[PDB]
């Protein structure tokens, strides 16, 4: 299975995260799983005209392209020319057009590629967009009706960056005959990773249940949930970040950092407008503006009051102790 991994408006974080892959690690994925990595800007040996030969052979159908991985945004500025992202003699968006049209499967890795991500933040100088989404709005660069040659839409492996497993396990599934096991949600994300929430497996959910808030960073995060004071988007964000830990160690929320909802197409949420960074926007100083997914402010708040009154003592003390 040939893989061509291109980077548009990328920071290469998805590649670096991918390189952190374990079980399989990246080398075993590239070699031992029958995935022929044709080229990758961070890893491909070919430069210049040899690399362009590889790209053109993929684009024109001279050689098969099974998986086109795209990382980074599709940069369309200036004026829709895409010349703020010139790659191998073309605007990167033209490469995207050709290769997405050539690939059996197109995988957008990372929010930039999936939805536009950080570069698509206003004022979006690069005219960045995702492959098939611009933020939540379906269509992105390739249009809502784009399908790869295997009939799939762009497989969106979101995250900023995506966790290595979010792509590697998909690649293994494709390589092991389990492509049919891959189900995609409405954002084209693999449901095997994105039916759960970041909160799922969060070490602070018991504090969340009892509405015990982390009050401060550092040692303050030895207790409490980050939802109330730090804008944790865990309960509104689909991800397996607390199921499949980052770097096989931790997750933002475990570590005391609020989930920024990076697997969600709106990321960065509120465009990091003043007062929204590591803060919970609240109505009347008590009611979070955004409640967990599938809840309503009145039942949430009622249950929150009930949970506060019935809170056990341990939920009000440090638990992640030295």
């Amino acid at each position: 299975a040939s893989v061509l991994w291109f980077q548009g408006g990328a920071c290469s974080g998805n590649t670096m995260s991918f390189l952190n892959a374990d079980e399989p690690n990246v080398v075993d994925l590239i070699v031992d799983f029958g995935l022929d990595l044709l080229w990758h800007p961070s890893l491909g040996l070919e430069l210049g005209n040899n690399a362009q030969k590889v790209f053109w052979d993929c684009a024109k159908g001279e050689r098969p392209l099974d998986i086109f991985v795209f990382e980074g945004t599709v940069i369309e500025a200036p004026n829709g020319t895409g010349q703020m992202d010139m790659f191998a003699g073309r605007p990167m968006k033209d490469w995207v057009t050709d290769l997405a049209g050539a690939a059996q499967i197109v995988v957008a890795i990372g929010d930039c590629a999936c939805f536009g991500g950080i570069p698509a933040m206003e004022p979006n100088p690069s005219g960045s967009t995702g492959l098939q989404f611009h933020k939540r709005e379906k269509g992105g660069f390739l249009g809502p009706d784009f399908r790869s040659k295997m009939g799939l839409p762009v497989i969106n492996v979101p995250g900023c960056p995506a966790h290595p497993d979010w792509i590697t396990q998909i690649l293994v599934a494709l390589a092991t005959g389990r492509a049919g096991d891959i189900t995609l949600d409405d954002l084209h994300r693999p449901e095997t990773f994105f039916k759960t929430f970041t909160q799922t497996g969060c070490t602070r959910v018991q504090f969340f249940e009892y509405k015990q808030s982390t009050l401060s960073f550092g040692e303050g995060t030895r207790t409490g949930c980050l939802f109330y004071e730090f804008g944790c988007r865990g309960p509104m964000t689909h991800s397996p970040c607390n199921r499949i830990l980052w770097n096989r160690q931790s997750s933002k929320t475990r570590a005391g950092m609020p989930c920024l909802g990076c697997t969600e197409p709106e990321f960065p949420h509120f465009d990091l407008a003043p007062g929204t960074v590591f803060k919970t926007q609240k109505v009347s100083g008590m009611i979070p503006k955004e409640v967990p997914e599938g809840t309503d402010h009145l039942t949430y708040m009622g249950l929150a009051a009930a949970a506060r009154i019935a809170a056990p003592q341990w939920s009000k003390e440090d638990m992640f102790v030295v």
Binding site: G285, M286, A305, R308, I309, A311, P312, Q313, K316
Partner: protein, 59 residues
């Protein structure tokens, strides 16, 4: 004897039936009294929870 009379009431089919039904749901009564004991032994905590809740509405 008065105690003999309570034993006599215990013989009564209807009294016995009710006492047997009480002993059937005795686990519920036990758990509710245990729940009350728990609530009482954590009454200080629940009072501190109501204090922190009112103290938030104060701020």
């Amino acid at each position: 004897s008065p105690v003999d009379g309570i034993r006599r009431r215990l013989d009564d089919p209807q009294v016995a039936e009710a006492l047997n039904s009480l002993l059937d749901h005795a686990d519920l009564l036990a758990v509710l009294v245990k729940g009350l004991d728990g609530f009482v032994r954590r009454g200080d905590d629940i009072a501190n929870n109501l204090t922190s809740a009112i103290g938030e509405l104060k701020a």
